Amino acid sequence: SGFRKMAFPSGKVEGCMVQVTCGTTTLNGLWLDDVVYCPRHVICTSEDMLNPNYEDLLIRKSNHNFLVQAGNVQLRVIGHSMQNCVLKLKVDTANPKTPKYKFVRIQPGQTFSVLACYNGSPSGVYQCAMRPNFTIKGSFLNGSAGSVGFNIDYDCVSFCYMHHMELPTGVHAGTDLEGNFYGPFVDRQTAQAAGTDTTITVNVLAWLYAAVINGDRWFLNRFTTTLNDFNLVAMKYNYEPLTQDHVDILGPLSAQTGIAVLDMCASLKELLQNGMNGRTILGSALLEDEFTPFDVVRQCSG
């Protein structure tokens, strides 16, 4: 038993991380087969960052303007192109440590592990969720762009995120691996702000089930509600509406605990209206929304 913010093991991804330098700008790249993927703003200088024309900036470079290192081994750039907001650097050597992989775009509410990197070297791993406003609450310093987010399905690494930049509120924004931003952001230093965030209701319910499984039952009650009555109070507290697909997804957790989904919604409803009043759930004094139903099953069953 127990419950932790658990990341996927990062070994398969650590072998794909490289350093990319162009000019006086160094960041991280992802080396799969014979292509290195990195954020396109590596080709920027400081005078370009307010309003760059990446088309012009790219045509003024040649393959030898890009320094790519895998540890101490240097990689020879033999071609480059831009795909949306990423650069694709064709290199002369295929990464022998290339895992089976795919490129997926995730939806708000889903979670993934982030391998934070500096100068091509993995520094730490942590778990986060894609927020309803398409930002992530990450931990990133200067030079972290090109760090990637991933899930592991069986033996296949699904890459879903590449880090680009930090917003003024301290949250983070990035692209999928095809270079398309999550959210309404662009990689130029203009004033941009995220939309208002909301709480991911289905994730809070999953976490309450994890609590029950681990012996925390004080918030339960005998009542029940309906999807419409619950959704009515949820809007008041900036919680995401709950759909029947969500109820279905919570099925295995309902079964394992013998507590119906709509029973659990009744407990949540009362928690929102009266607070925790000095009690904790799974060691937290706030309702946690960054565990999916699948995260909970994976940790509380295997």
Ligand X SMILES: CC(C)(C)[C@H](NC(=O)NC1(CS(=O)(=O)C(C)(C)C)CCCCC1)C(=O)N1C[C@H]2[C@@H]([C@H]1C(=O)N[C@H](C#N)C[C@@H]1CCNC1=O)C2(C)C
Contact residues toward a second copy (CB under 8 A) are 1-11, 14-15, 115-116, 118, 122-126, 128, 137-141, 166, 170-172, 214-215, 280, 283-286, 298-302
Q: Rounded to whole angstroms, how far apart are CA atoms 299 and 282?
A: 14
Enumerate residues 6+ apart whose C-beta is below 8 A from 195: 133, 134, 183, 184
- Please state the closest distance from residue 187 (CB atom) to ligand X, in A: 5
Residues 281, 210: Cα–Cα separation, whole Å: 10
Torsion of CA 72, 78, 82, 87, to 10 degrees: -10
Tell whether residue 24 is a contact of ligand X (CB under 6 A).
no
Determine, following the binding rule CB under 6 A, whether residue 150 of this chain makes contact with ligand X: no
If binding means CB under 6 A, how many residues of this protein chain bind ligand X? 20
Q: Kindly tell me which of 118 and 161 has the beta carbon lying closer to a second copy.
A: 118
CA atoms 127, 294, 274, 233: torsion sign:
positive
- Tell me if 167 contacts ligand X by CB under 6 A: yes
- Shortest Å, Cβ 45 to a second copy: 23
* 166 part of the interface to ligand X, by CB under 6 A: yes
Shortest approach of a second copy to residue 115 CB, angstroms? 7
Q: Which is nearer to ligand X, 12 or 40 (CB)?
A: 40
Least Cβ distance, residue 9 to ligand X (angstroms): 19
Sign of the C-alpha dihedral computed for residues 212, 138, 101 and 16 taken in this order = negative
Q: Which residue from 245, 249, 240 is spatially nearest to 133, judged by alpha carbons?
A: 240
Q: Which stretch binds ligand X (CB under 6 A): 71-79, 154-162, 163-171, 268-276?
A: 163-171
Site for ligand X in 40-99 (CB under 6 A): 41, 44, 49
The option from a second copy, ligand X, none interacting with 110 (CB < 5 to 8 A, set by class) reads none
Q: Give whichever of 157 and 194 is closer to ligand X, judged by the CB atom.
A: 194
By three-state DSSP, how is residue 130 classified? Answer: coil
Taking the least distance from each CB to a second copy, the nearer of 8 and 31 is 8
Q: Which of 7, 41, 1, 9 is nearest to 25 (CA)?
A: 41
- Binding segment (CB under 6 A) for ligand X, from list 13-21, 62-70, 79-87, 137-145: 137-145
Question: In this structure, which amino acid lies at residue 21?
Answer: T
Q: Does 192 bind ligand X (CB under 6 A)?
A: yes
User: Closest approach of Cβ 122 to ligand X, in Å?
Assistant: 15
Picking from 42, 39, 36, 33, the residue whose alpha carbon sits closest to that of residue 17 is 36
Please provide the size of the chain in residues: 302
> In 67-80, which positions are buried (b, 16+ CB within 10 angstroms) versus exposed (e)?
ebbbeeeebebeeb
Show the tokens assigned to 183. 């959210």
- Which entry of a second copy, ligand X, none binds 206, CB below 5 to 8 A by partner kind? none
Stretch that binds ligand X, among 166-174, 217-225, 241-249, 285-293 (CB under 6 A): 166-174
Cβ distance to a second copy smaller for residue 99 or 241: 99
The letter for the amino acid at 260 is A
Cβ proximity of 290 and 111 under 8 Å: yes
Task: Give 54 or 159: the residue with its C-beta nearer to a second copy.
Answer: 159
Q: Give the interface with ligand X as residue ranges (CB under 6 A).
A: 27, 41, 44, 49, 140-145, 165-168, 172, 185, 187, 189, 191-192
